[PDB]
Amino acid sequence: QHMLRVCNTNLDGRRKVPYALTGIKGCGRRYAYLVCKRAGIDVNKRAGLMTPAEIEKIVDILNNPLNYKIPVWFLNRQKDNKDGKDSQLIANAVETRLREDIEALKKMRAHRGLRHYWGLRVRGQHTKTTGRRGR
Amino acid sequence: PVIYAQVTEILGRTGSRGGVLQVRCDIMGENRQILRNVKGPIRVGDILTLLEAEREARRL
Amino acid sequence: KLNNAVLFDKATLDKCTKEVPSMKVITPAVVADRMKITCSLAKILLKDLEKKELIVPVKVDNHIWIYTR
Amino acid sequence: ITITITSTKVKAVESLCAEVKENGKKKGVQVKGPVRIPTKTLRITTRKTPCGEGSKTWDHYQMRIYKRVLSMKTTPETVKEITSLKVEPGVELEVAMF
Amino acid sequence: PKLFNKWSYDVTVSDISLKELLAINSKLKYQVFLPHTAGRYQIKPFRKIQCPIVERLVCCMMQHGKNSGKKLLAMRVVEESFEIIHLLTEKNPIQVLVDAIINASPREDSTRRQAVDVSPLRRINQALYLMTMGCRSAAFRNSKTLAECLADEIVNASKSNTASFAIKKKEDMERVAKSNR
Amino acid sequence: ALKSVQVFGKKKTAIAVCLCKEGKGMIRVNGVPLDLINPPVLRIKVFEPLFIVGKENYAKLDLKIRVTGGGQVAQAYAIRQAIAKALIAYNQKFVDETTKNELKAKFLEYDRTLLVADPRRCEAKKFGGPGARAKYQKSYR
Amino acid sequence: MHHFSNIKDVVAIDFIKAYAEHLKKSGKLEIPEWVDTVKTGMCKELAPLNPDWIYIRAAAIARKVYLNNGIGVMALRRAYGDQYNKHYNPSHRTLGSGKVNRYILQQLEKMGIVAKIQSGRSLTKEGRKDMDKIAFQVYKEHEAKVTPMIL
RNA sequence: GCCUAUAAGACAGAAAACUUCUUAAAGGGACACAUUUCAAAAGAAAAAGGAAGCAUUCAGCAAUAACAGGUCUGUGAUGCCCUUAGACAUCUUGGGCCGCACGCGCGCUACAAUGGAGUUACUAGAGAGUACCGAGAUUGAAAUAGUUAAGGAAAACUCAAAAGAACGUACAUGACAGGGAUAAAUGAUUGGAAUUAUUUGUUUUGAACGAGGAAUUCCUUGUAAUAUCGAGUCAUUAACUCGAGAUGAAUACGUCC
């Protein structure tokens, strides 16, 4: 199957398994290699050669990292607010968590949130010369 | 049809700046003197290749 | 623009094995262009055909692989 | 004993280097050879101008430190007695007892 | 001695304008075990002729900025290129490099235009420089390795082939100079 | 016993101090053999003087070489100087000079630098430029 | 010619290669929990691709203590380091991972291959003796496969 | 003392002899003298020898006269003018010099396969260090960093190399695993104080950029270029500057366009 499907995200099957899991917006490269070792799936294999009987483990292993021996400092979302202290960010949830967070500062009218509204450099950089997108 | 010639003496450099040398050559086929404009490094000992030997490069 | 495929098929394997040894110079850079397959696969066939002895190596190292008939 | 001499003038220490060695023939029998420790240049670079104007120019100041070490057995009480000899300005003499 | 303990120096040059200007076998020092000689060929006029012919090709493969000062890597490409070249023509790669230089060397240049002849030393300098452009450009963003990319350039320019990058340039200016008489 | 001759080779900064004495052609460079030099591309580079005059001359010489500076290519050239200098010194103090003369003439008939060090050194950096001759870019307007 | 006097008479990489199975066959090098969840230090962005990267690394460290008597973790961190080029600024050297390099040294103490001297870690009689025979196995393999340059 | 060899020696602890290398003093050593040619001459070129032959190379010092060039915001160098107890004098708290619709100058990183990524052995030079300065060694940690802590006022001790190379049936021409911008969580160091993120660690986020118009800069040999190291600033902070070594091009021996 040349075009795989997992956690609503389509990955190219012409690459190796670790380098096709990078298609998921919540999983990069270091995370991708770890789940390959955790799931007991060879890294040298291609993603488009893997049986579907194990693909359901990868979607499970990403949405349930605590039970599968993953260090807590490897998580893209640590110390989550509104209860819960686990990432659960390996999904299209990366954008969902990002937007509502910026609005939290905007609701409270923080300086970082205020800079987000104006589309300015948030992290305190020199805006005099660099970042000259036309407007 | 290319006929070579032997550089005999160097007359000087011309062509605005110095990038062309005027040398009087002789063709070893018949010992015929010829004057040509040479581009590049040249000295007395070496020879030159002339695909055309009907022109005289005296430059007026 | 190439899209030379990564997995093998009966079509090329029934034509690549009769003309690769007949070539004089065989290397992944020059062989992947003619049978329209990825040069990564050219590593597999060169070693696979080494077992059959159909192709004899003449320059093999960690940088380039050069084989001959 | 161990005589360590260091100064900014090469000939100041060198002249005194052989002054102790020659002096060792009396009230003693031998003085070890002069060890010439490598010199230590003190390079300081500054801008010539007192302001920002002008071209970018620098001057390369430097000062060299010459180190010589001597060894000698003798006696602590009568190594050189006075051990001053009215040493020239800019030179330093340090004696490592025992 | 041999260039890589594989290639001898029993090479001949057809024309007389380049026999003395190509360092092949006249002096023992031209036959060198490695194309890495640390001499000073750029301290006096007409001193670069003493450099080995294979040596002068190695240096041209060290250009375009990010490859500056990498001669060991450039030697590796040349060393692996001659083995490919030897197979492609069943002859000595040293012989193959020499005859390709004669064919790829332009014989006329135009100066601001005015068509003038080209000195034999400039013919050699442009000969290596023209084929080096093709290897550099063709191997850019291509699967073919630099050694093989350089390998096909020399053999094409060896006989007459128009597929050579250098051969196209040689006929290009000789045709432009034909319109600059 | 074990008559010895001490030589050294030089380069940009590499100093290749050798010690030639009676032996069996067992060359060790800082404890490693000459056949296992670090830059394997330059292996034939250091073995030319062995083939220049025949290894039989070096077949009974045991050289102990040490390198104390330079780079991986400066030391490669410094070794060659120490190898050629060692043979000349051995055939000078003990063996007749006429036999050494042919070896010396053969060495200088192929590579002069095999017995004389290259005097070139890194030039000092100058103010207003990134190197020894280069200068910072000039802007007028 | 060629002779064996110590392990400096063979190439470094293959001896460390042939020394990995010796640690593999012995089985006294246990596998901690962070073997796959860490990189070799600072500049790296990926964990080592070789599944047995510890065994080749442990053998490589065992060679370092053989050449140097008094060595430390800090002196080994710089040996196993790379260049830090994660931004636009020019790269500069950074030290390796102390934990992944001191862990191997501690384990090598239990095997008896190294001891704990006042100035770091140094080999023992069994440690010095063990690597010599393997250095001969590659030596005999090397001379049987390759032609000496002198000859 | 230890260990491997088939026969060489290796390593660890002192012991004591020399100076090829090392260091640093004194002299020696090229003056174009010696040959050929060219110009009664000052002189020029080849080649030889030589560590060294362009004034041997790179730098320092650097003539007379002048600018109404910059500096009175370096000076307890200074005239005149101005403010001179609600002060333009002095101190404290907070902010700004970082502010962005845009234009310009100096640079760093990239656009890749002469490469990025995973491993392995590497080879330098020249700097700096007190009572708390440079910090060794032992530990936990995934890293940033934490706890106890030798020796060192230093040829003594600390202070250490990557570009490149070797290793693999990895990558395979794909804005891909090139590029690391902008952001989001979180961990520490310095600081009395880090918000407008000081600096930096882990994971995720994966933007322009496919070699660059007119113009225009620097450069002739260990030079350019490429990548890096030390120091000045420094409680903490280089993409800067001043130096240092590591590989080592091409093109000229020319003319006033």
Swiss-Prot record, chain A:
GO BP annotations of the record are: translation
Which Pfam families does the UniProt record give? Ribosomal_S13
Alphabetically, the GO molecular function entries are: rRNA binding; structural constituent of ribosome
UniProt biased composition (Basic residues): 125-135
Q: Which GO terms describe its cellular component?
A: cytosol; small ribosomal subunit
State the Gene3D superfamilies in the record: 1.10.8.50, 30s ribosomal protein s13, domain 2
Per UniProt, subcellular location reads as: Cytoplasm
Q: Which UniProt keywords apply?
A: Cytoplasm, Ribonucleoprotein, Ribosomal protein, RNA-binding, rRNA-binding
Top-rank taxon of the source lineage equals: Eukaryota
UniProt family annotation: Belongs to the universal ribosomal protein uS13 family.
Question: Which HAMAP family does its entry note?
Answer: Ribosomal_uS13 (MF_01315)
- State the function annotated in the UniProt record: Component of the small ribosomal subunit. The ribosome is a large ribonucleoprotein complex responsible for the synthesis of proteins in the cell.
Q: How does it assemble?
A: Component of the small ribosomal subunit.
- Could you identify this protein by its name? Small ribosomal subunit protein uS13
Q: Which gene encodes it?
A: RPS18
UniProtKB/Swiss-Prot annotation, chain E:
The record's listing under CDD domains reads:
uS7_Eukaryote
Q: Which GO terms describe its cellular component?
A: cytosolic small ribosomal subunit; ribosome
Q: Which residues form a coiled coil?
A: none
Against SUPFAM superfamilies, the record matches this protein to:
Ribosomal protein S7
GO biological process terms, semicolon-separated: ribosomal small subunit assembly; translation
| Listed InterPro entries | Ribosomal_uS7, Ribosomal_uS7_CS, Ribosomal_uS7_dom, Ribosomal_uS7_dom_sf, Ribosomal_uS7_euk/arc
User: Which keywords does this chain's UniProt record carry?
Assistant: Cytoplasm, Ribonucleoprotein, Ribosomal protein
Keyword 4Fe-4S recorded: no
Location in or out of the cell: Cytoplasm
Q: Which domain of life is it from?
A: Eukaryota
On whether Cytoplasm is a keyword of this UniProt record, the answer is: yes
Query: Main role?
Result: Component of the small ribosomal subunit. The ribosome is a large ribonucleoprotein complex responsible for the synthesis of proteins in the cell.
Query: What is this protein identified as?
Result: Small ribosomal subunit protein uS7
Origin organism is Entamoeba histolytica (strain ATCC 30459 / HM-1:IMSS / ABRM)
From Swiss-Prot, chain G:
SMART domains, per database record:
Ribosomal_S19e
What's any GO biological process attached to this entry? Answer: translation
Its GO CC terms? cytosolic small ribosomal subunit
Supply the alphabetized keyword list. Cytoplasm, Ribonucleoprotein, Ribosomal protein
From which domain of life does this come? Eukaryota
Q: Where in the cell is it found?
A: Cytoplasm
The protein's matches in PANTHER family, at most eight in alphabetical order, are given as: 40S RIBOSOMAL PROTEIN S19
Protein purpose: Component of the small ribosomal subunit. The ribosome is a large ribonucleoprotein complex responsible for the synthesis of proteins in the cell. Required for proper maturation of the small (40S) ribosomal subunit.
Q: Name one GO molecular function term.
A: structural constituent of ribosome
Per UniProt, subunit arrangement is:
Component of the small ribosomal subunit.
Q: Which protein family is it in? A: Belongs to the eukaryotic ribosomal protein eS19 family.
Protein name in the entry: Small ribosomal subunit protein eS19
| Organism field | Entamoeba histolytica (strain ATCC 30459 / HM-1:IMSS / ABRM)
Q: Does the keyword Ribonucleoprotein apply?
A: yes
